[model samples]
Target: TPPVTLEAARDNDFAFDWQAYTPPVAHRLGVQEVEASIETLRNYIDWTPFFMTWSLAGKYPRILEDEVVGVEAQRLFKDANDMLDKLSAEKTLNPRGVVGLFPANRVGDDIEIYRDETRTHVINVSHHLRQQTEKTGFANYCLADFVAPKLSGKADYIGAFAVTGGLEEDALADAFEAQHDDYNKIMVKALADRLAEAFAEYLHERVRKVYWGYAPNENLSNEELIRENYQGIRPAPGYPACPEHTEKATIWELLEVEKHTGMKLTESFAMWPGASVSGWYFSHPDSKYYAVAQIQRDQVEDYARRKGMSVTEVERWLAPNLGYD
Candidate 1:
């Protein structure tokens, strides 16, 4: 197989498509979703940490390569190839680029995206919790603080993804499960998981090349290509680190993702097919990841006005980060 490059793994590709067929196959063989039976069968298979490695290594490489060792290190390195092999074999890695550089207008804790005078999107910047050790009373921090400096210019890029886990596999999984065919159901689920990660890696690769103007060096392994060390931040809502942000829903419409990828959002903002992921990509060297911990009532009320939503509506979405009841 050829080496996996950003250009090669475009979009809509999977590393191990066959694994997605496992559930339905097992169901056909009289298997069910029972934990005891599933656990026993899983022990017989050497499960590779493809998704785990990409997810971790891409975000925390030094810890994986330097801090971790022995069998664990061996496992990561061994499965690294498994990740690369599938990326190399993928032929339909079509990374949809829905990004644009617009003027950023920051008013206190909110940043507005001005595509033009008529088109604008205002995003809230929730504050972090105060540290006890800090000397000042105002130590609350947020991701917007880091993002603001980089975006303080004529243009700033906002990217969104509506990538899929293969419409065929999605349909096949649904069909099998609806008919009580657990084997294919399990297989489709597994494949969809890997495809989601693969799509992320593909988008990260493209961002590095297209937005950052970085060329892929042949010597660097696929492991290195996906790491955050390269520069940029792809923050998704509900991530443990960055808890509050409903701006992505607006981005879906801004990018017209439904027209491009056929992905639809529910009234509650959940994507259909149950295997897709979306987020905002930022190309700033100083753009680090941090949580938008908790917000004060003052910030909440002001943010509601900026986001053009009522305090009740904003509170509904950011309930986790609300500083008060």
Candidate 2:
């Protein structure tokens, strides 16, 4: 009998060939759309912390349901909600602001196919020193170092960026869910501590110079707004500020950080052609798989509203609200 070998590419010759081609193999990819209600968004976001903590407890086999850890997770969710509400109350976002639509479009189709631009800033404050100059507020300052002088007191901020499609969305979702399937998984084993660390890091990286407690940069006397403290990639905590002056701070500058850091830091930039939708199931009150994703979104929105600002403003104002010293 002759030996048979499997070829990796069915068609090996790369040439301008014309043939009656069969339709590309299409997986029965199903996407569902349900009207986006506030409850749904809240449920989706809330689920993340819960699932993270639950997975951790199950893995390490802690007291079945440790009250302290559970309480902390719940409390953090509350804090996140408070922040969301504060951002939502800004007058411009009222009535139609932050509205979520369902049955109108699938997240994948809306973000990717339609090119509906969506942005999520992943600011990295570590680069503040490098960003400092005689022309900028953080020219010589270690902004992040100031916030975490002893590696404590983490800061958080809002941002916008793009999300691309090549990154397996299904795989990411599965990984998030798998955390609870068994106690042996690494994530589940260290849920609470890991979640706390991740959340803390998320905030620290996102912190901007314009946090409510922070002051505008003193370096740029002519600038109207404070400069953002972070970048997308791991720019050291105390690097020199790009020699550019405050007048150069624009939407383009913010996006420049996203593009550069995205090349080096996957999480630093978002994917383009974002999912048509704007949520996850865990936070949703009506997610078929999980409602947690929606919950978290709602909590953040609600918190922003209570704070008397818009999510957009909060995201923009991040650079202005930080301690000057």
Candidate 3:
């Protein structure tokens, strides 16, 4: 199947669905049940909540070829720049929302999800999940299986967000001395961290609805519900967002994130808000987390072509996963 074009994947009016829930029974045939102990979770809700939107088209800067190696090395760089241009020219930035659901196909060591209508594919590197099958006791399972039912109605939905305190440098400069710039940075970062915690709580309770029909007792605090039940995973150089999977960052465009949240991505794909955090969310009780570890050159080449970029460019991003320094 051909890859989904960035233009075709654009969405803007993504609604923030909010709902309430009730606890459920412990046992059910064919379903696994797991619960978190109250002592295991921690709460950090003292920080204020902040939200904003951004427009990537003609806004975020594209990475220049000079920033990397050769023309071949700029494969990923050029693709990003071209995407921004298309976004701006085609007027695809009109704030629409796009989502899709797919049955999880556990092919060998990876999990492939095909978009509903387009059948554009997104593969999650699943070697880690394979390693955890025994530990999680969900033998030969993909992470998608456990949360399938929870995502049944909205299974096709792919969610992303760029959140920050929206703190301005001028404010920090006036509030503290130049020498305290380091301290101000720490303070700003703390706010972003807390904002992440708050968002996580909202996602678990309202968005993902991880505990909707079956949560713990009513006595449990929201913090407990989050720390114990809600799980958010950020892609790393060798993890969920391994260099090979970074192309999936286009998922951001589909969310119409820039207009929804004032978060801009650099050509390098780094969000403008230094303190902001963004990534995928998981709500499975048996969903154990792990890194992607070193992958082979063959896999890297395959992923590069899958992303429609050159091998050198893909390697540049997946350097850490290449198994050497």
Candidate 4:
């Protein structure tokens, strides 16, 4: 058998249903350009959340219901830059927010209210809107408002990923499944899978040297990164309500790892109440791409070891293959 690239395997394993995967009505045409100063541009580049989360929407323009998600991610980047500029003018340090940022739980609550049937659809919709707004606001807070201060004087980049409606509720399942059913899960899984693949492509093509600058850098392979890092990567230990044996950390933790070790680590951290991650890009004396991957791999492995399980066990139990062994 031929050695398969991730892209080739993805193409063969899944087919994108563009018809069903319509961009939201609002996202007919994508954003043209994001204007910012060179330093700000550099900052936007480093921030992992902005890039990782944005890549999901940017790559699958079809999956987006609207351009709101993409646009908001960009807007948050600009907002953070503005805050930084303001702080610089005043000669003050940037302000940072708390960790374990959870997206608003009101979304699930609203769904439950609608389930009651006593409430009118209009009322339910209103609740949903408020919940979404609050949740999204928290997401923005973590990515831009919180991260900017953390990366102050360190790097000049910000990026975030936003996953909306990744799950299908019993009520929503019928409507969505009737239209796509099994196909929808494929789309979601494909989205998750493509995320890892695309980021690897970006690093290999644009930032390969960053990883090669360090030891174990020669061992660089996207397959190894994805297999070793993605599986069993849960929130950092010590987080509350974190899925059992799942790694949960904050962007702060990621940055700390990178700062101490000069590596780029990408995994779901405490970014609101969702399975979201963030990233930051910067140039340092010792920083390299693979180092980042390695730091993250170590962090994740430490978490798993503490839980008394291995990556295989986590992947097998937490996220089994989609009917293809």
Cα lDDT listed for each candidate: 0.46, 0.24, 0.37, 0.27
For candidate 1, give the lDDT of residue 61.
Answer: 35
**What's the CA RMSD for each of the models?**
16.7, 25.0, 18.0, 23.5
Name the top TM-score candidate.
1
Q: Candidate 1 on 50-136: residue-level lDDT in tens?
A: 334334332333434545443464555455445334433563222222333333433334445544533354432232221111223
Per-residue accuracy of model 4 over 1-325 as CA lDDT, tens digit each: 2222222322232122323321111111111111122222222232443345445444322333345566655554465456445434653321111111111111211211121222223211101000011121122011112111211222112111121111222333345467876644333333323323343233322222332221223353444443433111111222221222223232334224333222233343333212123332222222222100011233234334544669566444333211122
In candidate 4, how many Å is residue 324 off? Answer: 41
Q: Which portions of model 3 miss their true places by more than 4 Å?
A: 1-158, 167-182, 210-227, 230-245, 283-285
Residue 242, candidate 1: C-alpha displacement in angstroms: 4.4
Error of 4 at 265 (Å): 18
TM-score of each: 0.61, 0.20, 0.50, 0.21
Q: For candidate 4, which ten residues in a row score worst on lDDT?
A: 124-133
Which stretches in model 1 have alpha-carbon errors above 4 Å?
A: 1-105, 116-139, 148-155, 212-220, 225-227, 240-242
Error of 1 at 137 (Å): 13
Query: Can you rank all candidates by TM-score, best first?
Result: 1, 3, 4, 2
lDDT of 2 at 67: 67
